[PDB]
Design a binder for this molecule. Structure first.
Ligand code: MG
Ligand code: MG
Ligand code: MG
Ligand code: MG
Ligand code: MG
Ligand code: MG
Ligand code: MG
Ligand code: MG
Ligand code: MG
Ligand code: MG
Ligand code: MG
Ligand code: MG
Ligand code: MG
Ligand code: MG
Ligand code: MG
Ligand code: MG
Ligand code: MG
Ligand code: MG
Ligand code: MG
Ligand code: MG
Ligand code: MG
Ligand code: MG
Ligand code: MG
Ligand code: MG
Ligand code: MG
Ligand code: MG
Ligand code: MG
Ligand code: MG
Ligand code: MG
Ligand code: MG
Ligand code: MG
Ligand code: MG
Ligand code: MG
Ligand code: MG
Ligand code: MG
Ligand code: MG
Ligand code: MG
Ligand code: MG
Ligand code: MG
Ligand code: MG
Ligand code: MG
Ligand code: MG
Ligand code: MG
Ligand code: MG
Ligand code: MG
Ligand code: MG
Ligand code: MG
Ligand code: MG
Ligand code: MG
Ligand code: MG
Ligand code: MG
Ligand code: MG
Ligand code: MG
Ligand code: MG
Ligand code: MG
Ligand code: MG
Ligand code: MG
Ligand code: MG
Ligand code: MG
Ligand code: MG
Ligand code: MG
Ligand code: MG
Ligand code: MG
Ligand code: MG
Ligand code: MG
Ligand code: MG
Ligand code: MG
Ligand code: MG
Ligand code: MG
Ligand code: MG
Ligand code: MG
Ligand code: MG
Ligand code: MG
Ligand code: MG
Ligand code: MG
Ligand code: MG
Ligand code: MG
Ligand code: MG
Ligand code: MG
Ligand code: MG
Ligand code: MG
Ligand code: MG
Ligand code: MG
Ligand code: MG
Ligand code: MG
Ligand code: MG
Ligand code: MG
Ligand code: MG
Ligand code: MG
Ligand code: MG
Ligand code: MG
Ligand code: MG
Ligand code: MG
Ligand code: MG
Ligand code: MG
Ligand code: MG
Ligand code: MG
Ligand code: MG
Ligand code: MG
Ligand code: MG
Ligand code: MG
Ligand code: MG
Ligand code: MG
Ligand code: MG
Ligand code: MG
Ligand code: MG
Ligand code: MG
Ligand code: MG
Ligand code: MG
Ligand code: MG
Ligand code: MG
Ligand code: MG
Ligand code: MG
Ligand code: MG
Ligand code: MG
Ligand code: MG
Ligand code: MG
Ligand code: MG
Ligand code: MG
Ligand code: MG
Ligand code: MG
Ligand code: MG
Ligand code: MG
Ligand code: MG
Ligand code: MG
Ligand code: MG
Ligand code: MG
Ligand code: MG
Ligand code: MG
Ligand code: MG
Ligand code: MG
Ligand code: MG
Ligand code: MG
Ligand code: MG
Ligand code: MG
Ligand code: MG
Ligand code: MG
Ligand code: MG
Ligand code: MG
Ligand code: MG
Ligand code: MG
Ligand code: MG
Ligand code: MG
Ligand code: MG
Ligand code: MG
Ligand code: MG
Ligand code: MG
Ligand code: MG
Ligand code: MG
Ligand code: MG
Ligand code: MG
Ligand code: MG
Ligand code: MG
Ligand code: MG
Ligand code: MG
Ligand code: MG
Ligand code: MG
Ligand code: MG
Ligand code: MG
Ligand code: MG
Ligand code: MG
Ligand code: MG
Ligand code: MG
Ligand code: MG
Ligand code: MG
Ligand code: MG
Ligand code: MG
Ligand code: MG
Lengths: 47, 272
RNA sequence: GAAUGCCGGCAUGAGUAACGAUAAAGAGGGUGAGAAUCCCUCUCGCCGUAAGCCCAAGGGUUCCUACGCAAUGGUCGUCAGCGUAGGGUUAGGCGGGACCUAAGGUGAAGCCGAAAGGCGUAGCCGAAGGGCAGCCGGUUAAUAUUCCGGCCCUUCCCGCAGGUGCGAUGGGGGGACGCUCUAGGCUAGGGGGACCGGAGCCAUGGACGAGCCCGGCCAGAAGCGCAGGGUGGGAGGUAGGCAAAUCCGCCUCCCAACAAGCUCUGCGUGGUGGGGAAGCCCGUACGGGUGACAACCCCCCGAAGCCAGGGAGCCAAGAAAAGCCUCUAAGCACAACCUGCGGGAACCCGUACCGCAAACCGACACAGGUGGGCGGGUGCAAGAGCACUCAGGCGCGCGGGAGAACCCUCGCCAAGGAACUCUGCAAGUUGGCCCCGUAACUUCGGGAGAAGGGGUGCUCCCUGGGGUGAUGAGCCCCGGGGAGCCGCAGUGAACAGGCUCUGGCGACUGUUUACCAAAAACACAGCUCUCUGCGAACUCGUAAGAGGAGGUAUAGGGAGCGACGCUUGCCCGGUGCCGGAAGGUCAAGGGGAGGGGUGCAAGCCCCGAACCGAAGCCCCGGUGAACGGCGGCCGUAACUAUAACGGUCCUAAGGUAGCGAAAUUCCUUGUCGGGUAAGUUCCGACCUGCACGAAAAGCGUAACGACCGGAGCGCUGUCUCGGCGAGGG
RNA sequence: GAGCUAGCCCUGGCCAGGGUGAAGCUGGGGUGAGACCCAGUGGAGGCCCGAACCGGUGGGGGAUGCAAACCCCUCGGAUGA
RNA sequence: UGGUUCGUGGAGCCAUGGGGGAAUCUGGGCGGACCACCGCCUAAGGCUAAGUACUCCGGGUGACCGAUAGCGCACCAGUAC
RNA sequence: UGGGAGAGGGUGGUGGAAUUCCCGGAGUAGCGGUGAAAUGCGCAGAUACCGGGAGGAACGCCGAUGGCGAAGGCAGCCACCUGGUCCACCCGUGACGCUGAGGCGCGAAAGCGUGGGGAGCAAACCGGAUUAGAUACCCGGGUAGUCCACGCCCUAAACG
């Protein structure tokens, strides 16, 4: 049966991308939590 | 008149399609007019406002001239009576002698070859738009503005007709198809004659298909719902609504007058 | 020492279930220390509209080669999609970007929002939509429309050559479009050949023969040829395409009325270029050589593909922008632009491998899921079905024996056929084509495949039509008629409805509880009520704003019923709604009679009664396809019985038509009849309706239903009543 | 967080092969002209059968499964909501 | 209406959103409704270190821990998953 | 050939009296109804008076015991189209005539389908009065219907 994860680099990068997080003020604060705790990947590595 | 169907299959015994014989042999439309894409939509900023609207055949909007005073005193000859899917009323082409091409609402009796003139002149017979300060009392008229220089806003649907009953100074009273006697300005333009194709009521959709093809999605009865969404909804088998018939937002839907009573346009209204 | 406590370790179950589709294995020869599992050969089996090839996503070294087997592989392992190391992805023409725009997003101008932020015509972003220039072979272990070979093309930049008023984000043409059904000519693909070329082979009884088997193509500029698409041409006037305009549009006269001509495609032909089987010999895991001066010819079927913007019909009425052409304005007419010929320049990213799967998503080498294209041959009427089989790829990563019970899956059965049982649940019968042949009823279409029957193979003869070859042979389609043969059986295997009567409910096609409910539930056309005069009513939002709708009473919203036929009676006392500038009550405000507190005083500050004060509520009317409701008792007619009738109490009024033990009836298996031998179910009636009833509609209604209930015929392991046999455990 | 799922917008694609034979049109009959009735063409439909496809009706298996929704036989739709 | 202990309480004072709406020292505010006396300041413009709070970093100390503790990590950790 | 009469029929246009509703002016204690009253309307200002607007159905006098048509039926007026009928001439055709089973056409009112229109009248229906009772005759209201376009009904005291 069709499961929940049907990958797409386009949807992943337009949704959880850095340029999508820097626009919204909620997403800008998302990067503050990841930098101050020290995440190695602030945004999901999309290729 | 319309043509019925033999019941070769079900939903055809009742389905009746209109008469397409008055349409001239001009099935494809004319470009340089209608280059607008109809913005097919159902919501404003995503959230649905008008419920049960969707589907529907793809259409193209034909830009219609409602400002007939742009070419006052300039005659125009019709050469095509076309079908407009954005309207119940048919349309007609206007090949002006000036050279401009424009779509106009096609009233009844407007045949090919007849020419149409606009302005305070242009005698009384179909198509000729005149301001209400010059149209004779007791005549059939349509495409009426309510306020000057704003465009035709009254009696644009099929078969509708407006009749002049009197005069009040610079204002002229009108008998609208709903029966309202509204006092509109005399300088408001109006096109004589009845809109025609009065047989739009006489058609029968036959099945649910034509509703979906027109774009009307299924209308869910409010009693089949549940109390969180609709007031009528809930209870056991076939709730007899148990309260005054209301709408999903709580307001009553049977006999509650909703116009504003403090409206400044109420002093130009007489009847129902 | 305990909290179904937290973390870690090891037991029990236990050498038990399982080892992941029943598509299937066996032998011989190699390597190796170790082979059922790796390599090679032979035999066997499976898929073959895939279980085979080619793309787009996603995955991101998995590809190739050398060396390995500690871990991964449901066993082994010398193997690998695993470990170590090296190599491999080459583009002006393929795809994407220095091209365009749609939904949507962003957003200068402008509007809004306590802040964050939100809307927003123009502009921009935004794509398997438009536009654009490459086809065929060869090489590597791994790449190729990318490298090589042949042939053909596209942009710019600079020069001479010939022409012209050139000339833009601006104007106009064009780009430009639906669904169904189809004509003409071609191509892909395929069938045949007594024609051509082939190593070879006569086997086991016969056959040296028009014998068997294999193969008889691909691309290809310019001209040609065939088919097809787009297009009229002048001459005036002109107030319109938001400046100008010879372009476009509109009016008039002329010749075309054609596709003649001018263009643009497709296909065939074409200088030249390439491929080239089966069999045998080799040694690769795989390629090579030869067969090879290889032939490369003729018929037939022939598309859903090409000419493409073809044609006809229909209504539900079928994107935008740029590339291209034309027009002109500032400018410039030593410029610039068009055609043609040279020389030069042509960037950035991907190309490997998987890709109905062991590499994507499902924790797994998971029987699940995944978009497009090719998808051969024969037979069954056909077809992408079904059975077998080319090319290709596999035997699904535990096996060997045995032949218990028991379970799954499958086959057969005496005699009876529903007695089993909630129910023929399951299973079984029928089953495809052709020809007879059909009922009540009905909305005249249907019901209809009704039901129910007959023919179906092969051989011989006579014979009719088409289509392609010329008005003939061959080839390919359908027939018609007459003789005869075999078997139990002729859609001989596979795929390919059991039927009839009636009732409930819903008109019908559909839709839904992903993962227990596909239904009488939802929806549907259709009917009614009600709101709504356009800055509409209503919805979302604090607002701007947007939907409605670039709609305008034949339109839009809400509510109810839910096709169609006949109908929807009474109550407006209560509630809702509608209409009522009277009256009562009614808060802030006006108003100050009068009174108070302070001071020596003017003054200052409080209360503060009549009187005028809106909406609402009360009051008066109307409204039930609005919320809702729609009685009881007693007595009377000449066999009894009953009550057409009369009287009385109360409510605002006191169920009409139609139906009725019902999806509604408790008593109740009401009672009569029909069915059965036997009928708490079923059907037709009576009415005593606990507790039907007219739009939460009433009564019927042809057709339809994987809905529900009852009966019957054919049929069977469903049962008396079980027995046996196969495969997987 | 709408890569599952529900609806809608923009743009593309897919539905083999058989039947049924509406309207229209041509010819004939017919009338004063029609209406209308026969053939022939025609190819309509939320039409019939049935694969891909989309579902998930009935039964059996499965139940620490191949599977946290599966498999076999059967079944509904398959030019349209 | 908010703030202050202040919740309408006799509700002042300090800010205000709405309506009306003056004066320049014999002018105004306050001293908890209001009035008189007596006293305190002189509003509707603004600037200002010091002393005060905190620990990403460095140092010192510890009747603080010692790999199931101590920060989530003494170890290439906000990693693998 | 030449004239005539006629409410013959179909379409379009158009006029006035009156009813009803609305707006305005002015006016007060009732109006209405019947054999009699009552329901009802009326201090929230009605009936009656005047002015203006709206809308529909019928056409007063002429108008008749009249006319026209096969029948049902047909009345303000104008215009268009087309029936039928009468008179004078003796011209033409030369019996071409009469009736008519079946068929076809028309066919009042009421009724049915779709849509419009709806002033008045008015089945069903509410209320008052009458009567012993009154599902009625009388009175206050009131829907379908009366009208129009098309389609269907196709009956009758369709009666000379
Ligand atoms: Mg354009
Ligand atoms: Mg938007
Ligand atoms: Mg948004
Ligand atoms: Mg519900
Ligand atoms: Mg609620
Ligand atoms: Mg109930
Ligand atoms: Mg309820
Ligand atoms: Mg109730
Ligand atoms: Mg109103
Ligand atoms: Mg203890
Ligand atoms: Mg312990
Ligand atoms: Mg433990
Ligand atoms: Mg053990
Ligand atoms: Mg055990
Ligand atoms: Mg055991
Ligand atoms: Mg075992
Ligand atoms: Mg296995
Ligand atoms: Mg297995
Ligand atoms: Mg071996
Ligand atoms: Mg070794
Ligand atoms: Mg096979
Ligand atoms: Mg095959
Ligand atoms: Mg990729
Ligand atoms: Mg992976
Ligand atoms: Mg690797
Ligand atoms: Mg490999
Ligand atoms: Mg190993
Ligand atoms: Mg192992
Ligand atoms: Mg495994
Ligand atoms: Mg490896
Ligand atoms: Mg560039
Ligand atoms: Mg770009
Ligand atoms: Mg763009
Ligand atoms: Mg846009
Ligand atoms: Mg924005
Ligand atoms: Mg925005
Ligand atoms: Mg925009
Ligand atoms: Mg493209
Ligand atoms: Mg390209
Ligand atoms: Mg080429
Ligand atoms: Mg490869
Ligand atoms: Mg020159
Ligand atoms: Mg130029
Ligand atoms: Mg240019
Ligand atoms: Mg343009
Ligand atoms: Mg052909
Ligand atoms: Mg070829
Ligand atoms: Mg061929
Ligand atoms: Mg051959
Ligand atoms: Mg040879
Ligand atoms: Mg022999
Ligand atoms: Mg051949
Ligand atoms: Mg010109
Ligand atoms: Mg101009
Ligand atoms: Mg000129
Ligand atoms: Mg060619
Ligand atoms: Mg050739
Ligand atoms: Mg060769
Ligand atoms: Mg190989
Ligand atoms: Mg196709
Ligand atoms: Mg095409
Ligand atoms: Mg076309
Ligand atoms: Mg652009
Ligand atoms: Mg100049
Ligand atoms: Mg560059
Ligand atoms: Mg490549
Ligand atoms: Mg490749
Ligand atoms: Mg598969
Ligand atoms: Mg799983
Ligand atoms: Mg495996
Ligand atoms: Mg798998
Ligand atoms: Mg997997
Ligand atoms: Mg698939
Ligand atoms: Mg595929
Ligand atoms: Mg094929
Ligand atoms: Mg085949
Ligand atoms: Mg065949
Ligand atoms: Mg098969
Ligand atoms: Mg059998
Ligand atoms: Mg037996
Ligand atoms: Mg037997
Ligand atoms: Mg039997
Ligand atoms: Mg029994
Ligand atoms: Mg038993
Ligand atoms: Mg029994
Ligand atoms: Mg049963
Ligand atoms: Mg069964
Ligand atoms: Mg059989
Ligand atoms: Mg019968
Ligand atoms: Mg029939
Ligand atoms: Mg039947
Ligand atoms: Mg049969
Ligand atoms: Mg025979
Ligand atoms: Mg034989
Ligand atoms: Mg022949
Ligand atoms: Mg036989
Ligand atoms: Mg089967
Ligand atoms: Mg069948
Ligand atoms: Mg039934
Ligand atoms: Mg019944
Ligand atoms: Mg149903
Ligand atoms: Mg159907
Ligand atoms: Mg069906
Ligand atoms: Mg579903
Ligand atoms: Mg479910
Ligand atoms: Mg869920
Ligand atoms: Mg659930
Ligand atoms: Mg179903
Ligand atoms: Mg608006
Ligand atoms: Mg709001
Ligand atoms: Mg409505
Ligand atoms: Mg219902
Ligand atoms: Mg019903
Ligand atoms: Mg009722
Ligand atoms: Mg009431
Ligand atoms: Mg009342
Ligand atoms: Mg009340
Ligand atoms: Mg007061
Ligand atoms: Mg005093
Ligand atoms: Mg009041
Ligand atoms: Mg007696
Ligand atoms: Mg009685
Ligand atoms: Mg009754
Ligand atoms: Mg009963
Ligand atoms: Mg009985
Ligand atoms: Mg039983
Ligand atoms: Mg019964
Ligand atoms: Mg009874
Ligand atoms: Mg009752
Ligand atoms: Mg009921
Ligand atoms: Mg009801
Ligand atoms: Mg019934
Ligand atoms: Mg029925
Ligand atoms: Mg169904
Ligand atoms: Mg069903
Ligand atoms: Mg058995
Ligand atoms: Mg056994
Ligand atoms: Mg066995
Ligand atoms: Mg989605
Ligand atoms: Mg396909
Ligand atoms: Mg026919
Ligand atoms: Mg169908
Ligand atoms: Mg199932
Ligand atoms: Mg189910
Ligand atoms: Mg099961
Ligand atoms: Mg069967
Ligand atoms: Mg079926
Ligand atoms: Mg089907
Ligand atoms: Mg406070
Ligand atoms: Mg306070
Ligand atoms: Mg203030
Ligand atoms: Mg004070
Ligand atoms: Mg004090
Ligand atoms: Mg100051
Ligand atoms: Mg400061
Ligand atoms: Mg400071
Ligand atoms: Mg400080
Ligand atoms: Mg630790
Ligand atoms: Mg330790
Ligand atoms: Mg008056
Ligand atoms: Mg006459
Ligand atoms: Mg009548
Ligand atoms: Mg009627
Ligand atoms: Mg009816
Ligand atoms: Mg009366
Ligand atoms: Mg009356
Ligand atoms: Mg009649
Ligand atoms: Mg009779």
């Amino acid at each position: 049966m069709k499961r929940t994860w049907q990958p797409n680099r386009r949807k992943r990068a337009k949704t959880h991308g850095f340029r999508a997080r820097m626009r919204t003020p909620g997403g800008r604060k998302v990067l503050k939590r990841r930098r101050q705790k020290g995440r190695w990947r602030l945004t999901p590595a999309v290729r | 008149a319309v043509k019925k169907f033999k019941p070769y299959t079900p939903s055809r015994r009742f389905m009746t399609v209109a008469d397409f014989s008055e349409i001239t042999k001009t099935e494809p439309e004319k470009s340089l007019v209608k280059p607008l894409k109809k913005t097919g939509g159902r919501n404003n900023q995503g959230r649905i406002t008008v419920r049960f609207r969707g589907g529907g055949h793809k259409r193209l909007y034909r830009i219609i001239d409602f400002k007939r005073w742009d070419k006052v005193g300039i005659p125009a000859k019709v050469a095509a009576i076309e079908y407009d899917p954005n309207r119940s009323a048919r349309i007609a082409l206007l090949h002006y002698v000036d050279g401009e091409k424009r779509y106009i609402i096609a009233p009844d009796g407007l045949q090919v070859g007849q020419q149409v003139v606009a302005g305070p002149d242009a005698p009384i017979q179909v198509g000729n738009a005149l301001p209400l300060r010059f149209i004779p009392v007791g005549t059939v008229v349509h495409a009426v503005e309510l306020e000057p220089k704003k465009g035709a806003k009254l009696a644009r649907a099929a078969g509708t007709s407006a009749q002049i009953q009197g005069r009040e100074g610079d204002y002229v009273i009108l008998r609208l198809p709903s029966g309202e006697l509204r006092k509109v300005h005399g300088e408001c333009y109006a096109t004589v004659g009845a809109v025609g194709n009065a047989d739009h009521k006489n058609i029968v959709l036959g099945k649910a298909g034509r509703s979906r093809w027109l774009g009307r999605r299924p209308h869910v009865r409010g009693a089949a719902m549940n109390p969180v969404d609709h007031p009528h909804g809930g209870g056991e088998g076939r709730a007899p609504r148990g309260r005054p018939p209301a709408s999903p937002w709580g307001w009553q839907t049977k006999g509650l007058k909703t116009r504003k009573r403090r409206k400044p346009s109420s002093r130009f209204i007489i009847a129902r």
